[PDB]
Amino acid sequence: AFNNNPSSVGAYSSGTYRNLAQEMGKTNIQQKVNSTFDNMFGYNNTQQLYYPYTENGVYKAHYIKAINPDEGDDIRTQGQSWGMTAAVMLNKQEEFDNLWRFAKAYQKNPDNHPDAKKQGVYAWKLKLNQNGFVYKVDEGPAPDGEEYFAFALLNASARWGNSGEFNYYNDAITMLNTIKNKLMENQIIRFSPYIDNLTDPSYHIPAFYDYFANNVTNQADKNYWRQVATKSRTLLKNHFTKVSGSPHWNLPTFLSRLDGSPVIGYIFNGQANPGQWYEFDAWRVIMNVGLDAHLMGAQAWHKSAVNKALGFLSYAKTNNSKNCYEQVYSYGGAQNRGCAGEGQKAANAVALLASTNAGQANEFFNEFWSLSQPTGDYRYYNGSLYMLAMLHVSGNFKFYNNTF
Template sequence: MKSYRNIFLEIGKSQEEIETRLNETFDEIFYGVNKFYETTEDGSMGYLVDTGNIDTRTEGISYGMMMAVQMNKKKEFDQLWNWAMTNMYLEDGDNKGYFAWSVATDGTKNAYGPAPDGEEFFAMALIFASHRWGDGEGIYNYSQKAKELLKVCLHHEEMYGGHNMWNEDGLIKFVPGLEFTDPSYHLPHFYDLFAENCDPEDETAWKKCAAASREYLKKACHPKTGLSPEYSYYDGRPYPDHEHFGGRHDWFYSDAYRTIANIGLCYEWADKDTEFGTWCRATANNLQEFFANLPSEDKRGIYEIDGTVLEGKALHPVGLTATIAQASLAADGAHALTAVEEFWNTPLRTGERRYFDNCLYLFAMLALSGNYRIW
């Protein structure tokens, strides 16, 4: 049975303290004073609200499902999945078989296209739910729904005439109809497991995706700072389109925080003893070194990926603290335990922007306590 590193023990916290803190974090997000989890009147569905935009997103619903399966919270998992299938699933149109990335809190679709990070988290959470709890009926036949979704992602063009979510080289797209990517979408440790749990004919394709993403991440993360852009070309170069998608995304900003957290988890799940794992360790060390050496007033700012400090402050500073700490799953440098200590001493965020920060916070809490696991 695979063992998982508990770094909180390494900074002197007791197992009881760690378990209490993890449970309190989940409870605050789902049921506390500053919660952003809501349920429908009949209790059949649940959704995480993006408190900055007052909508529900496949990002948040699928994140919530991953949190729930890791925490053994089947009720909340099923409520979230019911919301996704009832209000987000696209039964027809150009994106049939995918999920609408933004839906109002009353269930009305704000968009009719997907964001692929939602689909990949849906699929991984469903696979884990099947392994942890067993399959049910209908939409709760988790393994079947995961296989269906994974098939659509790779074969949408031949099945429905639309766009696949992964390109011919095995790289995930920012959205199916556009030819660039988001480094934080690249989850080779998920694709390894997709290959084991998909329809047999797609096993080779998912292995190709895993290998392609590992090579891509080496190009997307700066060799000295470890920073990655929010969007990039497939060769890793920052994507410079400032006129669309709400402005700049070629810098290290909100989406990009997730990349190093993903690299840390990939190291823990799959790559401790591989060549890619050596790269993960060096990249995590570089990123933590970069932040440790910044003047205090610049530590939660906005940066070019080469480390140039730009004007402005991070929109999600707590989320950034969480992901710098999660990098310690791979890092072994002078700042690895210090980053975890800083995260432990940082409270959950309050206020209107708490959704994204606190999702990253709970994932880091799971990962650093050895509770973000392969099921």
């Protein structure tokens, strides 16, 4: 049965990881987790997201391919970092190393880049040119990429040690330094080095910062990351307060001010969507809230955030001609951007780790569990989230501490 009374003590502290699929009475859970990884990281061109990169017939590294039928396939730091995270959780070292080799070689902007703001950050969009060779389309970062890179590398160090191809630990501390020095404003993760008073709620994963704090050696840095964790929970608490009821109707948004206020409309040249949209990025917010509740303990705010958000989506489904909740909402209004796909359902399943409604949990979890693994042209985002969710709901997303 679903545990609708999630502990205020986190798995990180207790060592007790929930198996949500087991609570929900599912069988062959680990087999399904294993097959999900195998298909995503197998040469099947079906579920596959993990692809080798070669230069003049010489093998170099691997990348997560952001398949894009409209604008051409590209390569993203989010997908790369999520892929490494999945690999370390399942003890898949070659897959991890191949992805990390690619990121370090090809995504990393040089430390001596003429623009100080780009030094050591990871270029969010790469492509292969007409001759098949990799190049940077956009040198600007997507900062939750660096966050997951640091997280994955710290875990890789803890599981595998640092005497092989990579000193994972040194790579992780370097990544943490880059986040601190390039991607933060007053201990809140940035949307951009070039814009102040701006964050993306989906970049907030408070438990990661607590894990960072426990894996750095010096006192100042330990305190720094603990403060980032607290300020992140505050940001999310404030955001959820601000999106409660009218006019945002309980869904978190794409962009936020540092006080948690949703950004209204457009604010910068190049902006993909209005700030107040619950869209593709925003899907991840309650997933992160679920993560934080599981790993660091469920508090009143976690439960309220998820309960109200899932509450809205259930309501929105009843008022939809297609009997689905949709991928994009603004001010509680459907934006006609399609029925929820696998990624959104996946994110919402992970959110259940903070849910206190067994009925809600049954509906949202079964809708996720009944899905086939993403295939086809939209599988990059759907499939990446599906993989992460499969780990989260099977008790496989764990924090591996380094020893000092």
